[PDB]
Design an enzyme around this catalytic site. Structure first.
Site, PDB file in Angstrom:
ATOM      1  N   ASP B  92      -1.833 -82.758 -29.320  1.00  0.00           N
ATOM      2  CA  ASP B  92      -2.150 -83.983 -30.036  1.00  0.00           C
ATOM      3  C   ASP B  92      -1.201 -85.100 -29.586  1.00  0.00           C
ATOM      4  OD1 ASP B  92       0.152 -83.560 -31.485  1.00  0.00           O
ATOM      5  OD2 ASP B  92      -0.884 -82.612 -33.156  1.00  0.00           O
ATOM      6  N   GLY B  94       0.773 -87.058 -31.404  1.00  0.00           N
ATOM      7  CA  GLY B  94       1.915 -87.278 -32.262  1.00  0.00           C
ATOM      8  C   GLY B  94       1.712 -88.341 -33.316  1.00  0.00           C
ATOM      9  N   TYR B  96      -0.489 -88.864 -35.758  1.00  0.00           N
ATOM     10  CA  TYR B  96      -0.824 -88.515 -37.135  1.00  0.00           C
ATOM     11  C   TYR B  96       0.411 -88.055 -37.895  1.00  0.00           C
ATOM     12  CZ  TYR B  96      -2.961 -86.367 -41.214  1.00  0.00           C
ATOM     13  OH  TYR B  96      -3.307 -86.029 -42.507  1.00  0.00           O
ATOM     14  N   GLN B 193     -12.933 -93.573 -33.964  1.00  0.00           N
ATOM     15  CA  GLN B 193     -12.488 -93.975 -35.296  1.00  0.00           C
ATOM     16  C   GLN B 193     -13.606 -94.753 -35.994  1.00  0.00           C
ATOM     17  OE1 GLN B 193      -9.920 -92.917 -36.939  1.00  0.00           O
ATOM     18  NE2 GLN B 193      -8.697 -91.916 -35.363  1.00  0.00           N
ATOM     19  N   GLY B 220     -10.307 -89.084 -37.916  1.00  0.00           N
ATOM     20  CA  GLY B 220     -10.336 -89.741 -39.202  1.00  0.00           C
ATOM     21  C   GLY B 220     -11.142 -89.053 -40.278  1.00  0.00           C
ATOM     22  N   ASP B 270      -9.599 -77.333 -34.633  1.00  0.00           N
ATOM     23  CA  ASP B 270      -8.257 -76.813 -34.864  1.00  0.00           C
ATOM     24  C   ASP B 270      -7.946 -76.993 -36.335  1.00  0.00           C
ATOM     25  OD1 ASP B 270      -7.627 -79.916 -34.417  1.00  0.00           O
ATOM     26  OD2 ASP B 270      -5.914 -79.075 -35.504  1.00  0.00           O
ATOM     27  N   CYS B 308     -14.225 -56.656 -40.068  1.00  0.00           N
ATOM     28  CA  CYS B 308     -13.335 -57.248 -39.091  1.00  0.00           C
ATOM     29  C   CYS B 308     -12.818 -56.213 -38.108  1.00  0.00           C
ATOM     30  CB  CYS B 308     -12.162 -57.865 -39.858  1.00  0.00           C
ATOM     31  SG  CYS B 308     -10.931 -58.645 -38.787  1.00  0.00           S
ATOM     32  N   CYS B 310     -10.150 -56.619 -36.187  1.00  0.00           N
ATOM     33  CA  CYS B 310      -8.780 -56.898 -35.792  1.00  0.00           C
ATOM     34  C   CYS B 310      -7.874 -55.690 -36.020  1.00  0.00           C
ATOM     35  CB  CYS B 310      -8.251 -58.141 -36.508  1.00  0.00           C
ATOM     36  SG  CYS B 310      -7.384 -57.881 -38.085  1.00  0.00           S
ATOM     37  N   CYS B 313      -6.904 -54.860 -39.688  1.00  0.00           N
ATOM     38  CA  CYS B 313      -7.913 -54.164 -40.458  1.00  0.00           C
ATOM     39  C   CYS B 313      -8.151 -52.751 -39.960  1.00  0.00           C
ATOM     40  CB  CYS B 313      -9.186 -54.997 -40.470  1.00  0.00           C
ATOM     41  SG  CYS B 313      -8.994 -56.561 -41.395  1.00  0.00           S
ATOM     42  N   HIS B 339      -4.769 -61.369 -38.811  1.00  0.00           N
ATOM     43  CA  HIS B 339      -6.114 -61.167 -39.330  1.00  0.00           C
ATOM     44  C   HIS B 339      -6.879 -62.494 -39.435  1.00  0.00           C
ATOM     45  CE1 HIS B 339      -9.544 -60.255 -41.767  1.00  0.00           C
ATOM     46  NE2 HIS B 339      -9.165 -61.273 -42.522  1.00  0.00           N
TER      47      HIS B 339
HETATM   48 ZN   LIG Z   1      -8.916 -58.193 -39.795  1.00  0.00          ZN
END
Ligand SMILES: [Zn+2]
Ligand SMILES: [Zn+2]
Lengths: 373, 373
Positions: B92, B94, B96, B193, B220, B270, B308, B310, B313, B339
């Site tokens: 980014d 900077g 914000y 914007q 914005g 993000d 999930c 991952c 899990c 997770h």
């Molecule tokens: Zn998970």
């Protein structure tokens, strides 16, 4: 594998190297046990603890009995399943932390009642209850419940606490033996007491050997006496213990303390130093400890240690870890802890290999020369 | 690989799926970028971030310029080497965080001067300096420096800030283009914007397209307006942007916000929500979020989410993670964050696959029905 078999493969002076076989795994000795406080070696997944070389970890009974609770852990399948570590776990008895961390403690020949430091809830520990809690957790190596002796201690107080500890050691033995599943699958260690006094250490060793344990801890050291005094007490105390069983020095310690204790016949160690001090910025190296927060590391591209084989030293710089610790980032604690535990395991491996090769005396000298340069 | 190539492989309504090729790697779109604050995705090693499926991460220029410093990072070899992530990084500008976190800010047509929130040190950001800092970090996707518009904003103030942002977008373009190494190896995104006002959003899109960028962010939004209003603005705003370039919705968001934004033509996202809220105890599941600190989870042996894939899990229970978070343990933050980031990546994968298969509308409906049950 058997419930418990300690075999000594090589010796040099008082130092020994070998293995403890247990149902959940083999422990290479001399061994360093990372400390799991409350079902975690702080900032590490269990698989990372294993990857550093640890064969066994320690669990703190006092913390676990308060949070999440021993009966709860048992209902959830035991500590191993709960925390995700499937190899041996040694549990302490809880007695030391009751005295160091809890409040409103009331001591008696039966045990201790105390208030939790987290919420003021009321709790009791006794030889019988401590052994039961360690059973509920599913501990592989169970520590007898004793009464710790502060340093300094008068001869009278050291004797009284040692004598109580020996009565409690017999109670611990009988409690462990009266629970068939525990007796058949876990091991029980007794704890030698007696402060710095040779005659009391001898009486304690004799009492413990008469009861009979799978291993013997040297208790009551590393409580403020300093290395010279600790080594002096080990000099006479370790030979009093049965030679053919493991010798465990509780709560030690710094790398040089470990080396000197092995030179005096100790086989097992635990301490929070590598984990706790790692989160505080201290990193162990073969050239001595460094504090990564020091500004001198802000642009240092070298790894924490120039020889360390750990994943942290393969991948990241001192400058990065300096930044993380200064910023309070969790990853800083993760990386410092992984490195420090890996360093400790590499130390133990060098100790084991040097004893096996009959060159431990030279290793200790070379280690000290460089570490204290 | 090229410096930058966005290719759309499939479409359904306004939704698109495809790839951005860059020198450091391929980014699958729609993409979710975990947020690296100060050279770390909090509580995760970069290899763990990658294992969850992330193709690109975001770095916060404001934090990095304060600690460890942009020139320092450049001297140490750049952000990728420093932090251990070798794939694309979007930074980014900077701007914000200067407005949300810093003090004594002085704004002008040239840029902003401000005092660090960490130590009161004085700093400046401008289009030129922001682009330079992102160069020093070695960013792959550079964000133009703009002037953010609070919500609510009057039409006059929204217009003034949009107009300034467009002048600053041209300055950012020229600064980026005048640095050969940056122009040849990184990409530059412009930021639309105009607050909630269609005419200002159109003027902003027209200005940005005339300058020309590699991608276009919708700035914005997610600043307090609520989902209905955000979606209403996206409805008219995204079609104004060039169709053949990525569309990036900055700072969004919750899973349902992501799904609806993709339905409206957004390709990149993000947010700190999965990491920050993970450390606070919120875990995402296909049945909606849960707060693992709730006592109802204290003995729940199920994983965080029933489907999930991952590693968290696969290995640990809700009961264990409940305990860790209640105890303040670092491992709790590690596991919750892994997770949640993995959940977000699985969401993006399901979005990409459903668009590729022409069944995204059905996926969105099924997702909402279950998530809000
Ligand atoms: Zn998970
Ligand atoms: Zn290392």
């Amino acid at each position: 594998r058997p419930r418990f078999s300690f075999s000594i493969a090589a010796r040099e002076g008082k130092a020994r190297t070998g293995t403890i076989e247990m149902k959940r795994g083999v422990i290479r000795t001399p061994a360093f046990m990372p400390v799991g406080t409350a079902a975690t070696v702080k900032a590490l997944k269990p698989e990372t603890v294993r990857a550093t070389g640890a064969d066994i970890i320690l669990g703190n009974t006092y913390h676990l009995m308060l949070r999440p609770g021993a009966e709860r852990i048992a209902k959830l399948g035991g500590l191993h399943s709960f925390m995700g570590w499937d190899r041996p776990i040694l549990t302490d008895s809880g007695g030391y932390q009751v005295m160091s961390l809890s409040s409103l403690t009331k001591q008696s020949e039966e045990g201790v009642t105390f208030k939790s430091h987290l919420d003021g809830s009321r709790h009791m520990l006794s030889p019988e209850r401590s052994i039961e809690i360690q059973h509920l957790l599913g501990s592989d190596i169970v520590m007898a419940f004793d009464e710790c002796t502060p340093y300094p201690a008068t001869p009278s107080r050291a004797a009284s606490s040692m004598e109580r500890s020996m009565r409690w050691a017999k109670r611990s033995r009988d409690a462990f033996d009266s629970r068939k599943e525990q007796a058949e699958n876990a091991a029980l260690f007794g704890i030698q007491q007696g402060s710095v006094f040779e005659n009391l250490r001898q009486q304690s060793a004799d009492a413990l050997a008469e009861i009979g344990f799978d291993g013997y801890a040297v208790g009551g050291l590393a409580v403020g006496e300093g290395q010279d005094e600790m080594f002096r007490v080990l000099d006479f105390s370790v030979p009093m213990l049965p030679d053919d069983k493991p010798h465990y020095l509780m709560g030690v310690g710094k790398p040089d303390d470990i080396v000197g204790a092995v030179e005096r016949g100790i086989d097992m160690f635990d301490c929070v130093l590598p984990t706790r001090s790692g989160r505080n910025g201290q990193a162990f190296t073969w050239d001595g400890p460094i504090n990564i927060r020091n500004a001198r590391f802000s642009e240092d591209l070298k790894p924490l240690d120039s020889e360390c084989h750990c994943a942290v030293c393969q991948k990241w710089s001192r400058a990065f870890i300096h930044h993380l610790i200064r910023a309070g980032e969790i990853l800083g604690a993760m990386l410092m802890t992984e490195h420090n535990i890996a360093f400790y395991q590499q130390l133990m491996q060098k100790i084991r290999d040097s004893i096996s090769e009959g060159r431990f005396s030279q290793f200790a000298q070379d280690f000290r020369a460089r570490y204290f340069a």
